[PDB]
Write a protein that holds these residues in place. Structure first.
Motif, PDB file in Angstrom:
ATOM      1  N   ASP A   1      -1.044   3.562  11.672  1.00  0.00           N
ATOM      2  CA  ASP A   1      -1.453   4.824  10.964  1.00  0.00           C
ATOM      3  C   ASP A   1      -1.558   4.728   9.476  1.00  0.00           C
ATOM      4  O   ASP A   1      -2.108   5.610   8.831  1.00  0.00           O
ATOM      5  N   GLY A   2      -0.976   3.693   8.921  1.00  0.00           N
ATOM      6  CA  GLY A   2      -1.137   3.412   7.498  1.00  0.00           C
ATOM      7  C   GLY A   2      -0.036   4.052   6.638  1.00  0.00           C
ATOM      8  O   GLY A   2      -0.295   4.344   5.498  1.00  0.00           O
ATOM      9  N   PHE A   3       1.145   4.326   7.192  1.00  0.00           N
ATOM     10  CA  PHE A   3       2.227   4.880   6.371  1.00  0.00           C
ATOM     11  C   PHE A   3       3.039   3.757   5.762  1.00  0.00           C
ATOM     12  O   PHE A   3       3.301   2.756   6.430  1.00  0.00           O
TER      13      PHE A   3
ATOM     14  N   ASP B   1       4.302   5.295  -4.226  1.00  0.00           N
ATOM     15  CA  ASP B   1       4.677   3.885  -4.375  1.00  0.00           C
ATOM     16  C   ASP B   1       4.156   3.046  -3.220  1.00  0.00           C
ATOM     17  O   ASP B   1       4.885   2.254  -2.612  1.00  0.00           O
ATOM     18  N   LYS B   2       2.852   3.208  -2.914  1.00  0.00           N
ATOM     19  CA  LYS B   2       2.336   2.521  -1.748  1.00  0.00           C
ATOM     20  C   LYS B   2       1.999   1.048  -1.978  1.00  0.00           C
ATOM     21  O   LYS B   2       1.961   0.321  -1.011  1.00  0.00           O
ATOM     22  N   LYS B   3       1.732   0.648  -3.219  1.00  0.00           N
ATOM     23  CA  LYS B   3       1.382  -0.698  -3.529  1.00  0.00           C
ATOM     24  C   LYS B   3       0.082  -1.079  -2.804  1.00  0.00           C
ATOM     25  O   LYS B   3      -0.150  -2.193  -2.399  1.00  0.00           O
TER      26      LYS B   3
ATOM     27  N   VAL C   1       0.705  -1.615   3.775  1.00  0.00           N
ATOM     28  CA  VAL C   1       0.231  -1.998   5.082  1.00  0.00           C
ATOM     29  C   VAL C   1      -1.284  -1.682   5.249  1.00  0.00           C
ATOM     30  O   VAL C   1      -1.949  -2.302   6.075  1.00  0.00           O
ATOM     31  N   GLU C   2      -1.817  -0.731   4.471  1.00  0.00           N
ATOM     32  CA  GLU C   2      -3.170  -0.353   4.605  1.00  0.00           C
ATOM     33  C   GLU C   2      -4.164  -1.484   4.206  1.00  0.00           C
ATOM     34  O   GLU C   2      -5.333  -1.496   4.683  1.00  0.00           O
ATOM     35  N   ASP C   3      -3.713  -2.404   3.347  1.00  0.00           N
ATOM     36  CA  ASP C   3      -4.572  -3.463   2.828  1.00  0.00           C
ATOM     37  C   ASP C   3      -4.357  -4.816   3.454  1.00  0.00           C
ATOM     38  O   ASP C   3      -4.866  -5.800   2.935  1.00  0.00           O
TER      39      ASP C   3
END
Ligand code: NAD
Ligand code: NAD
Ligand code: NAD
Ligand code: NAD
Ligand code: CA
Ligand code: CA
Ligand code: CA
Ligand code: CA
Ligand code: CA
Ligand code: CA
Ligand code: CA
Ligand code: CA
Ligand code: CL
Ligand code: CL
Ligand code: CL
Ligand code: CL
Lengths: 315, 315, 315, 315
Positions: free
Chosen positions: A53-55, C248-250, D164-166
């Motif tokens: 889910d991208g969290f 703060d997802k980076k 995690v999205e990248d």
């Protein structure tokens, strides 16, 4: 500096709390349990789900309270179930001991946390946990009423054939016989349930049966599952409370809250509607009762008093 | 087989509708306008935004009605503004002509659509659009009340210092002097506003001022923007209605709906609470008025009648 | 203590930024503009939309910089368009003056903010805004590459008939002739575009045309809209950057960032992939170029240098 | 006419699937199990949670297959665990019998469904379930690769300190020794992992250890939990596949899919990247292997062949 959520107890509700906190991007999560491996495994499983889910959230499990250091929110489910051969006193005895340990851990490691107690019997455990931890009374609350509200809303929405989004349930007190529903302050789109009976959208009998079904709702799930109690709705309910704190939403939610004179009560945790924001329990909404409601509320508070007396008796 | 949403008018509200439909993953979107380039550009811009949030939706712009073929939902904002030198009749004359063209396009190309009219003056334009398109009356509605509800909810939430999620506003009729608020069926957490005044959570004067501010709300935005009218809240409001249809949510929402005798009215579009699901307007919730409300509602309906008579006069 | 987002410029992009910040529950929003009424109106319109989706956020508009005090994020769109009779120098002259005022306002009122510049010509305006504001170079970035990435991803997903979620675009530098695409580091599900040509999933010609279409993408929207430039994708792109900071997802995102030697460059803002977290630009990902890419990148940097020299010439 | 999702098996993964389907508003849910009470209880618990987030979905539990009639998606977790005293053949024997019953139920009641098998041993159970149900091969898939991808993505994101999205992970084949990772088609922001080692963002040793950790990932959770296997990431992974079908997203996801010659294989279910849309498995992405990968893939397919032969031996 993401928010940090510590989940004390990593069982049925605690895992579900952890999953929801991820999905809702509420912050980092620490799962704590005395059973080693359990919180670490659930933490890692949820962490591994995150890329789907991208969290972005850190997940960890622990059995030392240092792991909860600086938690912004602490949600407590730690404790044991009332096995068929166990007394009420037995259960309280046991789970009071758990609250003692949990309170000590919060005191030392997360003194600035907003604490949400779930462990049963809730109105006593939340009272005990506040006393053991020494945290400010406005920073310790119990989840109960939101769950009752949610169940009643589900039954209403099914009855009227409308969205759950347009139903409101007003409940005070505790669960079961201690619940204090106000059907007149329960609504579909703003129209009170009592008026919906007059409109013929439902009947008095159906309304009464939905109230009773809410009283019995926890047991209804136990009777279906057999191995345990409800966990999806309990967890959702507490996450709503947590989110209101973390995002300063100032939701008005029925929770077990420390009363400093509101509703005529001093020094007890009682289920009442409260505004939850970044300062914790910020205000209690004290409604005006009719006679039937006053008497129901008085019974409910007496029930709480009797359980607090049992705690003192066992501790 | 994703749902298809056609947006007839690709101006301020129409672009915003298109953006929301993407973000909410409601389906494919066709933007239609007579100004060539505008719907194509906004469509492509929104399409190009999609990879940032991860919504999969086809976007296209058109100035031929064949592009709307098979639309599940059609939302109509097409029309012109009432420039300072324009009469009411002028405006109606002009925008009735637009409804004629739009109705013909829907009739031919999207006869099975749920149609949401936004174009002003709404209670006449929705009536005209249903007549021109020939679609079933339960499949054509107007957005107005949701917007009033949303504005009033914002003012209430600010007044009480609570979440917008726990406020309900009950409004019927149209905008401005034609709005019929029921403060007694408006609530914070189920508690009616009239009771919140008794509790001292607000005052009668503040409540009255919030009602008046809602009446004037559209003009308040015009007076700030100067170049146009509101668009974010109008678009959000109509998307709620669309989503209720597309997801069969059975939300209870105040909308301009065709009355077949409800509220004592036959053959007119009037703002009333309706359940919106996969069959369109599925039920009208007819509340019981007090005297003040009956008289306010009667004025409001007379206003609608006078505008319908002006339409017939100009067409 | 919700996060505070200040939007300097309340025009096409600024309104859209404000709407997205609400929908995404990123925090409180202040819209700032020199045109009085505009930011107040858009703020109030969005605020009034909030009860429809249930986001709790304060919205306000202002034309005094004190309103932005303590902003966590500041996103700058303030400036004027290059009207057909205006030189490049004219535009820079004008918008440099705007950056001067905006930089002074941030310096005084929001010195701890993460600043995202959008105003054109971006690689010069971001450089100027950092200099004028005096903020740390890691706390001032420009949005450009995310937009190019988003457009290219849309074109790719359409070409391959796959979800936008499974396409990655790698772009450095600026827009148009200054864009430096690496198709070999652009992928569907991890498979580079160069390999997808070998697999026959597309052709070299189609790939080249999608690269060119990305170069021209901004103009393509202008040519359709005629009255202005793109705003939905630009706003989405900058919100992704803001969210990465606030949560703060980076995320690793191509942005105009101050280089302290990376890519062989010192003292300039250049489009490069950067990790954005709670400390701002935390790391630059410096890839290894092939010859064609080195030469494209060198041209692109020279272009930036020439514009910085024009700034100094006009200021 | 909301979509209908049937969950065959209402255990650890099945409850989690049900919860996610609600939260994601994917449609109505039917939980099916042979243990009476379990699916009814979990269904009702989740239903009762719904008013907290506002999702409208019907939930029900059943032990008769008529309950799944007209399901759009069916996700199968039904089966038994391999207790320490059980052979591989024992397990297959048992769970093949379960697939027989489940296949018969789908055949009769949900013949138009997209079926996602989860039950172990997956590459055999999915093959068996397709054969037993008679559904088109493009409408029956197994979840495995998404889970491996998700675990590897989590480990990568932790290693590189990025969102995690990248991160993208490219995996084919099955789990454990049967997994076929392509680190060269795994990326951070489009940059392959093999290039990130050259850049010094990680090391070869760390990369190899993350690959091995992914191979062992399921066992790592078992070893922590002790009482069962992973469920949060498995459920999330299958929901991604379901959502791609229901919303026609055309995600490219590694799944156990029936090969009609792709990858040189005819008549087997093998983990490969597939596009999932409203027609099921719409395309297989067949990459070009290097030598090491060809040999790894050949071993992996031989493993599948050996398990299919064991099925035929036991049935
Ligand atoms: N307030 C309500 O409305 C409500 C509703 C449902 C359930 N409950 C209560 O919530 C509690 C949790 O329910 P559940 O289904 O998650 O239970 P569970 O048994 O699955 O989980 C409890 C966890 O606490 C752990 N634990 C035990 N002693 C501990 C200690 N000393 N320190 C830390 N952890 C310890 C256990 O190992 C276990 O993992 C129960 O008391 C239950 O009755 C409350
Ligand atoms: N119902 C309500 O509560 C409410 C609230 C706000 C605004 N409104 C009304 O909504 C309407 C739209 O407002 P807006 O701000 O988007 O306006 P706008 O002027 O930005 O957009 C209208 C669009 O319709 C187009 N158009 C004109 N004639 C047309 C035709 N014959 N066919 C197709 N398209 C045509 C225009 O080119 C324009 O792009 C206005 O009538 C406004 O008064 C209603
Ligand atoms: N970086 C990119 O990739 C990219 C992409 C698209 C657009 N742009 C640029 O973004 C900028 C904004 O575009 P837009 O469509 O929102 O423009 P717009 O003209 O709608 O908005 C600009 C706003 O800035 C205001 N403004 C002017 N002078 C100001 C001052 N001194 N202080 C404060 N506010 C002031 C204007 O009143 C206006 O409301 C433009 O420069 C445009 O070229 C950049
Ligand atoms: N494919 C993968 O990547 C992957 C990953 C993890 C787990 N798994 C597998 O998924 C499956 C489910 O795991 P789980 O943790 O949910 O198991 P679980 O034991 O909690 O649930 C299985 C459910 O199936 C039910 N069941 C048994 N026989 C049945 C029948 N004949 N008809 C209908 N229902 C029946 C059981 O009563 C139980 O509720 C297991 O086989 C497990 O090995 C697969
Ligand atoms: Ca995200
Ligand atoms: Ca009092
Ligand atoms: Ca998604
Ligand atoms: Ca009547
Ligand atoms: Ca919410
Ligand atoms: Ca270097
Ligand atoms: Ca909703
Ligand atoms: Ca081949
Ligand atoms: Cl995925
Ligand atoms: Cl992005
Ligand atoms: Cl609403
Ligand atoms: Cl709630």
């Amino acid at each position: 500096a993401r928010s940090k959520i510590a989940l004390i107890g990593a069982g049925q509700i605690g895992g579900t709390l952890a999953h929801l906190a991820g999905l809702k991007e509420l912050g980092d999560v620490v799962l704590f349990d005395i059973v080693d491996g359990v919180p670490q495994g659930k933490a890692l499983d949820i962490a591994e789900s995150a890329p789907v889910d991208g969290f972005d959230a850190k997940y960890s499990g622990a059995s030392d309270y240092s792991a909860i250091a600086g938690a912004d929110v602490v949600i407590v489910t730690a404790g044991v179930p009332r096995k068929p051969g166990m007394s009420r006193d037995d259960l309280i005895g046991i789970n009071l001991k758990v609250m003692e340990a949990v309170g000590a851990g919060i005191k030392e490691h997360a003194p600035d946390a907003f604490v949400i107690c779930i462990t049963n019997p809730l109105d006593a455990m939340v009272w005990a946990l506040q006393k053991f931890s020494g945290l400010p009374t406005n920073k310790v609350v119990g989840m109960a009423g939101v769950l009752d509200s949610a169940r009643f809303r589900h039954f209403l929405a099914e009855e009227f054939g409308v969205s759950v989004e347009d139903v409101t349930a007003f409940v005070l007190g505790g669960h079961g016989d201690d619940m204090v529903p106000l059907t007149r302050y329960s609504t579909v789109a703003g129209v009170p349930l009592t008026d919906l009976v007059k409109l013929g959208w439902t009947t008095q009998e159906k309304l009464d049966a939905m109230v009773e079904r809410t009283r019995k709702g926890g047991g209804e799930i136990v009777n279906l599952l057999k191995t345990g109690s409800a966990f999806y709705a309990p967890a959702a309910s507490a996450i709503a409370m947590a989110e209101s704190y973390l995002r300063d939403k100032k939701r008005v939610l029925p929770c077990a809250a420390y009363l400093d004179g509101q509703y005529g009560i001093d020094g007890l945790y009682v289920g009442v509607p409260v505004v939850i924001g970044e300062n914790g329990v910020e205000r209690v909404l004290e409604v005006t009762f009719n006679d039937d409601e006053k008497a129901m509320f008085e019974k409910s508070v007496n029930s709480v008093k009797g359980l607090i007396e049992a705690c003192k008796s066992v501790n």
